[PDB]
Amino acid sequence: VKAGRTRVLVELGHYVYTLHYYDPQISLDEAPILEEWLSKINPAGIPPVPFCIPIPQVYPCITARRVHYAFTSENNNDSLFSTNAASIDTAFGENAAVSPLRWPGLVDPNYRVGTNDLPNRITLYNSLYRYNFTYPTLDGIMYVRSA
Amino acid sequence: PFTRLVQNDVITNVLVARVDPAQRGDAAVDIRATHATFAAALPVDPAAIVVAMLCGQTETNLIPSHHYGKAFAPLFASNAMFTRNQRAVITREAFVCARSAVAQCQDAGFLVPRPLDALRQFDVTSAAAAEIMHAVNDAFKTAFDLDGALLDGLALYGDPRIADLSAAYLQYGGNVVREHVPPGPSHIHRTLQQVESTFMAEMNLFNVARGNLYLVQTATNGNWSPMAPVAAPPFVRGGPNVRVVGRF
Amino acid sequence: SAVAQCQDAGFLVPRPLDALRQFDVTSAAAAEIMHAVNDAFKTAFDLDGALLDGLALYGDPRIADLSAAYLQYGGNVVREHVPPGPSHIHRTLQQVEST
Amino acid sequence: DIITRPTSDSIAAVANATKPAAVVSDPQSM
Amino acid sequence: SKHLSAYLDSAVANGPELIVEDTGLCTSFMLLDNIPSAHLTKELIGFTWFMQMYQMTPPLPEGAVNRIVCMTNWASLGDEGRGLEVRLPPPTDSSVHAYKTVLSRGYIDNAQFNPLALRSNVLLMLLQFTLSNLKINKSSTFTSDVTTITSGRMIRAFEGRPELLALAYPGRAVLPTQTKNAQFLSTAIADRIGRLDRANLIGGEVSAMVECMELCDALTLHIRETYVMLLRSMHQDPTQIVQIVNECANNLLNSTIPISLRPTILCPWFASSEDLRLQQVMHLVNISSNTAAALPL
Amino acid sequence: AQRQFFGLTYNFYGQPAPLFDLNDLQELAGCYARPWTSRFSHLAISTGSLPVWSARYPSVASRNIIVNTLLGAHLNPFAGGQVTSHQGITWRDPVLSSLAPVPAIQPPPVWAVAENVPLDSNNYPTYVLNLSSMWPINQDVHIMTMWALSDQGPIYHLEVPVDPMPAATTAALMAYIGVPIAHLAQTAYRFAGQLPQSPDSTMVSTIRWLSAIWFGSLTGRLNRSRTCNGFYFEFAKPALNPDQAVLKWNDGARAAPPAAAQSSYMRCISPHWQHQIVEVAGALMSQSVTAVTGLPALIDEATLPAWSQGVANLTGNGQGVVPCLDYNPVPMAAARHLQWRQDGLITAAQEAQLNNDYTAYALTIERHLTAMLVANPIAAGRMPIQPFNAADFGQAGQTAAAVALAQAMFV
Amino acid sequence: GTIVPRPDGLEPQLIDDGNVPRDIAGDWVYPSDVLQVSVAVFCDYVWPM
């Protein structure tokens, strides 16, 4: 595999992943991380899958050609919120902006109170009720004395 | 029921079951072989009874309604009777959830929705079920701050996979009653189903992914997003010249 | 009159100061207005004891016209309004606002 | 003297919670 | 004597803890700055801007990379929690300990997870998630803001927790210098904030029930609304209560109730016969079935 | 109590079999639990808190509709006196406690499929002999029937006596002040559901009044200006979400009792009800009263679907027949707003605005539902939402008569 | 009162109420509100101009 003569598809329906960000301006090889990962696989169990992602940059930079091995077969990138939030714009790295879909009740002109898409997506800004229940004791309900 | 001198109606056993006899091959077996029976007796002395019968007397001009009015007054001053109601509700919710949890780990069971069925679950031995049931039972105890025995005793026979409640009594004439005690409609159980349905879509928020994993040498120099590949996956299973390793 | 002129939907009063900017007063906001007027009067006329406090301390200060009533079991309602008599300070105050 | 009274704490809390600095030192200011 | 004392007095408390109230935010997911943004002071000046230099707490994370992670009750101001939580670390860490509830203890290594028992552990974790979220969305004092960024509606001032106030209403942000956060927040609709409606029953009293919109995810909201729905299910009117008590005493000791407004009472004190039957059977199963067990009874 | 009931199963909209899949049954009545009081276990205070907007069961009424269809496949004992099986599932016991897959040794006979089956309690003697435990069946069967009898909205009954409210009901209502309608509906359902009760019970009269008050306020006759013994309902602003109502008590003028006892049957004539919580709760609450007390009289056949013509013990056209009225929410809202202006609660300018807001709101409900139907064509074998045509949203129905009734009901 | 700094030597811009950046130079109308919330920037990019 490291020689570029073989390609491997590891089949596993679901798993726990782990990320490890890196600067895209310096040399890097992902092999040691994977080799370490392999060094902990037993018949009993396995450690979480690792991944490496370059930190997005705010200026056009010179990137060192580095080698990667691992990547997924689907789009498992839903937990990502935004990149370079405190910056004017993301120049080089992947450019994720705040997706309006999770905030319909904050930016959608056609939003109606009392709607959602709960079984499919989670919205973070909604409308809700609040209460002020009191909890009277039994004697607070009735004339408790002899009858 | 109090039977009286009816030989065929004499009740010989009162019995309870912790397990559905339908699951195991006990559909048409003697009730005594399928339900556990009670056993208790109190030896009373006839002499004391006779004296009580013949030496009963009361106040000269007793008014029962008045006397009981005073007597029962302190017994209905607090929420004592209601705590048992609250415990019963929690017991109901705990029981349903525990059954739901165990069933979803088996391949099939008490017909219950299985939204998470795509995930893997290899061990289905009764030991796993017992461990799961204890986990659920302890979780409820912590959440609602209970101390007594909740949902326990079900695992007495050591196989929660077929736990079910029923009671019956047996008459000498061979008559049986065999009442069933199914749980009522819970609330939490439905919510938990909704949660699992939601999770199967938003699993990435729990550091859990889905799909296969590829390993290809790639000497990229620009942007690289492993979690969101833009190109189609190479050599999907069953493609040309792709080989599947042996099982050893 | 003062509270009515700060909530721009309230009890009907001449409104010479509507040209001035003002956020519409909620129930809590009006209470502060009610208190200040109360204190100003008690200071001006040197009065001890409650004069107008109940309007600020309890209920909604956004009053329109006080009324008291009692309910009979037969469903009949007997209501007695108490519209105030001719005030004098209110007139000159409105004049002061206008000028 | 002229009459004043403090506002309710809740009013003050919100007001104080939102007070951006009037003068901020940044290197690019003409 | 223990059993006899137990069987004779029912006033031993030990009732399930039903009433738990939250005054914080009905959310279970926290926006998280995972990778901090770099501070530039020699070259590339002005490419990034922090709300810190304006003495303001940003309503959104402003790191280089931001993540959504599950953390139960992370904003739960108010009453003490149920006592069990779910707190995933950011994906730059292991986050495996959250999946070792069962079938893991003596079997897998500390730094692994059991791939063959994934379904069960996931299910249990979700169960814990559900139980931890069983609270009541309690109201709190509202107020209007006399500041310039007012929308005309009253908002929920989190006295003593100002950071909550900043987080609760992203619409109230102050935006200089058009950052990626600003490019999103600048589209916020003006009045989608604060109290929307209320049930004002008694003059000068606190509103019995209020409806508002704020930072709140749907899933937790669905859970808690079901929880109160359950509580309502075990409640009856005082007329029912007094009738029940009178019947229990065989119509002796016939008490009654006053007649007046009782705005917001709640007496979760009842259940169904099926639950009673279920508990009765379960209780019998728990105890031993010999003559030494029924004797105290 | 009440030792007898009558019922009618659902209608197949041209399809050959009852419309529900195994998953529907498995989710909505599974776990071997009792299905007999579950109707409110999947409802809440408002739509915003519910997963009614997408996926399976994408409507407020969706779940209860499927439940009714599900029951139609297993109520054979009240039609033929025998428990049966359908697609391998049957009752666990003669008491009909719960469902389970059929046993392998002695399966019961397979049910022969049919639609609009009339039902009698007398066909299954064990029910009466076990009335104390089989009581919950009574309520649900009644509810299913009251829905099955009509297209569009379900049918429910209204009545107002010539007497004032008894003190007991007054005290009970005074404790339900700030409660939203949905919670109130649950208690009514919970009350009549779990154990037999006599019609001469305080709660029965209590709920009866609630249905009356709800309708009177719905028509706008009962307001802050004019109230029934001090009570009335308050509706949310159409500008945000008008699908909400709460109870209120007030010192306003009290309406006089009618010259003679008034009563009628009601239903919503337009598909909006399928996704409008106030309609669902109001119907269920009202139906609960009839469940415990039985039907006061036969329902008029004159304005009912074809299968509802002349159903024994349920519908009729003779002398002893109560008419059934119907309405469309949009015209109803306009009438309610107009009454408010005439009472002086609002100005003319406000009334025009309210009509615009409510019409805009209703349009969204229609647009959602019509899009949802094509997403779930009934030919797929399960009916999450009742079919309809586009013109059905425009029917005015008998709305004019409806407000006229309230006019006479609260003089 | 957001301003929009730009790279590559382009001098900054200001957000028109039509949500389109415009050049600082020229004529402008400030409602009191926007000034009260953006004085910090105004003191550094508009006032000098």
Residue numbers in the entry:
A (entry chain G): 1067 to 1213
B (entry chain G): 770 to 1017
C (entry chain F): 869 to 967
D (entry chain N): 77 to 106
E (entry chain G): 176 to 472
F (entry chain n): 2 to 412
G (entry chain F): 1018 to 1066
From the paper:
NTPase has an RNA-binding domain (RBD) with its “tip” and “main” subdomains, an NTPase domain, and a C-terminal domain (CTD). The N-terminal residues of VP3A conformers were shown to associate with and lie along the exterior of the TEC, on both RdRp and NTPase, and were suggested to anchor the TEC into place. Despite expansion of the capsid shell, the Zn-fingers are positioned as in ISVP, suggesting the Zn-fingers function independent of the capsid shell. Local alignment of the 5 TP domains reveals the enzymatic guanylyltransferase (GTase) and methyltransferase I & II (MTase I & II) domains remain stable (RMSD 0.842 Å and 0.907 Å respectively) while domain separation occurs along the flexible linker regions between the GTase, MTase, and flap domains. This separation is enabled by the absence of the VP5 layer that would otherwise clash with the ICP turret conformation.
Situated beneath 11 of 12 I5 vertices in ARV are TECs, heterodimers of RdRp and NTPase. Atop each I5 vertex sits a pentameric turret, composed of five copies of VP1 TPs with their axial channels reaching the nascent mRNA translocating pores of the TEC.
